[model samples]
Target: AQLPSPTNGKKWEKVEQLSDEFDGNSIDTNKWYDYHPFWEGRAPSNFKKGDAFVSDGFLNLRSTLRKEPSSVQDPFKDIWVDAAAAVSKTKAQPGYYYEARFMASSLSMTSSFWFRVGQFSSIDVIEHIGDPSKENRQDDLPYQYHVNTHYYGKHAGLQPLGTEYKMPGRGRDNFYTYGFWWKSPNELLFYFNGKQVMRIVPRVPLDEELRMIFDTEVFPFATAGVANIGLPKPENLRDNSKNTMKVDWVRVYKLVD
Candidate 1:
């Protein structure tokens, strides 16, 4: 689907890529935070400040074992199956472009790069929710990864479940660019390595601004009503063989006149 120009009949101009080669020891706090958004800071339990760092010119997000206080009165009342996430202080609106180059350590959990517009829209760029059979040899599953768009304001709790795409055998372990062009309210265009991958059509928020984020999270077994397997062993989730998501760079392009 062709998207309308965001400039509204105006000519286009310059484009700029944002900060952090991540060549430093840590992330620039002014530009990012180790927090789960949309909850509005209500669920800051699983994230650890030390879980994300800069090394060898890349930003690495590590999901490790963490013991935190959960319900002391119910099932698995004491749990340590926590995870990690990173959200940007850098924000943007509809009709622009956002991109990131990253790789996952394992298909044991979720390796995701997405965007959020608070309660309005959720642009699920790319999320690998683990492949069943404990290996990438499953031909019966839906390719183990998907894109989703969520509309909660007017639609309220409705999921605009996006399409599932493929990964060449063990390709999830390789670096690739995942991005989107939201130039119109009802259209979401996704791209992988400079090529158009998929188009998500439905309701999208044109009224709110979106921010980019990349994180590694774990969904315990049977948590959702899907065949996507959960943590192999809830008690040993922290010991999972793979537990990190690495990002090289993030860029945003603005359309102008």
Candidate 2:
């Protein structure tokens, strides 16, 4: 339960209201919601409440194959995937450190950790694609770590500011710590495994508090939203061995001046 020391002689203090060990047999309903209350989910993948659970000290977001296919358009004729999400009950402001220890599911669907305030603002700590075997395209490899900050509202259309590249290992291969310091309204400091990776200065103001979210999603390929490049196949989801995004714990810290 340690944090990277602040350089200005300040200290980091844990915020229990936004932290969770997931050691209990079930999730703490007071602090978390099994599904995203505002958003349903990405098309072709529904957010099922039962998909998120706790077991053996780990919080698991399980992606499953639906027995019956759901009819849809623009993409495939029918979709048959059920994903999970655990959203924070409380929102936090800037000037704090947010971290999570997690392992992505070894499947096509993305295992994501992020913060959001509707469609206005979002900070994607990690949107990892552990496997791309089933997809038609193979460009987004498993080792590539995707991080982004999105800002969209009346003033601005959609500003996605961030980058992705090859990291040390595959997301499913090990539990990695990913975090960020919302130093101020315009500054963001990213960290991976206790080390600094990147720093971003936003063009728009991220002044409002945001709620944390962890989920599995079926992402489209390239600029075309219809391409099903990374949606997990039914056979892969059936195998319980690696169809789960596992989180050891989550910790939030506020700087003590």
Candidate 3:
């Protein structure tokens, strides 16, 4: 009926978990950060603090393809995107467990579960790269997703664990808890509904503090293969394509005893 005591052998204690049931219809900036928090002219998807909200005891993260002006002469100039996202301000150190309960508004976008430790890098605990409107339905990528550990620096690259796992019904329209244990500097454990799904030990970031981020951002799937891949050309997006990533709660627990 309470957080496990120290003598119980549970190696974690509740740190600072935000219980903002979104009842206030506002995001607590002191305890959370917007995903595309950037300077003027550098914002991602025209992100506004108002996009993220709470009404039914859940944080609704919405995304739409309205971000644009790739560069001074951005070729995709005509199209633009505007979306919303958020991450916790609480920095997580090594030897801790973190998790969240989320329900997808739709499966097509990169609705995600992520942790940032350092180097423009983070752990892609689960990234569902999908969009149902497409014929394939992101076949190899839809029902399941990849759990990756990445490094984004001078030598930026990816260390994806493996193939995506297929959910029983649909990735969207369902609510499930996905999380990970940054077991140590060199090890990470992933879980789906409290069971181990994979282990990422190849490039676990140990030194930096990792934080939790949950967002819904749409990207261009049509042009990713050859050249352009920043944001999607708006019109190509489906009609009334407004969707959300609903979060019930986000919690963090640190090593105890």
Candidate 4:
């Protein structure tokens, strides 16, 4: 059956621009709430050096390793940055196309271009790194494409219904287009480079007030306790002095009724 398009006649709109070209450090607090130092323990020690910047026609959120003394928990901590550049203040409707052009190269760490169902709700689109050896199983390492919707209501929990698309080439440099087209309240179509990859139908209707989020995180690619074998140490860890994710542009198009 053909799916319904929530934004039938709506066009793309420019809500905001976040780049290093302008005042990059000054965040739109209304649309974005500080997740660091607040939710994730302590404030990032690297942002002070302006590790996150926009230039050469792209926005770069770089990660670095800075050994710092923390009074919160760990005495001597290996500091890392895992913050989201968000747009939760401007709620989105059901019918919209969220797109971003990005190139992830020499990424010893993982990067994501996705959004949540609602700030409080738990729907997510993730481009993760999984193991290439175990393609059959859910756990496998370069990256896996997923579209997951969590139901929170009568069910009161997370219900994920989507497939995992393994990366094309093993651990190589590549430019990819990640996007999601929301057709109806219950249906969402995921795409990669203009190709349809997966379709998800939620068990429950989506929330009316949904926000678009664009964020990146630096975490261990693999660990002894972790399922898959991630990238090596030092490389796996954020090196704010060097490594970064370059984003060309993030655009959203909504269909009007």
Q: Please, what is the TM-score per model?
A: 0.76, 0.90, 0.75, 0.65
Model 1 misplaced stretches (Cα beyond 4 Å): 1-19, 37-45, 67-78, 130-145, 204-206, 221-227, 232-241
TM-score order of candidates, top first: 2, 1, 3, 4
Number of backbone collisions per candidate, in order?
Answer: 0, 0, 9, 17
Clashing pairs in 2: none
Q: What is the lDDT of residue 139 in candidate 1?
A: 61
Q: Which residue pairs collide, candidate 1?
A: none
TM-score of 3: 0.75
C-alpha local distance difference test of each model: 0.60, 0.79, 0.58, 0.48
Give lDDT tens digits, candidate 4, residues 1-257.
12124444645543353211223544445444323222332233223223434556655545454442232254223444433343445656676676666654334344455544444344466644422223443233555565566555455655455565666753224556676777777888877776778887877766566655444443333321123323223443354333555556566665542
Deviating ranges (above 4 Å) for candidate 3: 1-8, 17-24, 38-46, 65-79, 154-163, 221-242
Give the Cα error of residue 107 in candidate 1, in Å: 4.9
The numbered model that scores best in lDDT is 2
lDDT of each residue in 1-257, candidate 2, tens digit only: 34767759988888898999999999999999988787777767778987989888988999998754434444332456788999999897788899999998988878888988554778887888778755544545667666788876754566578866567888888898888888888988888887878777876877788999999887655431122445566777888888999999999999787
Q: CA shift at 145, candidate 1, in angstroms?
A: 4.5
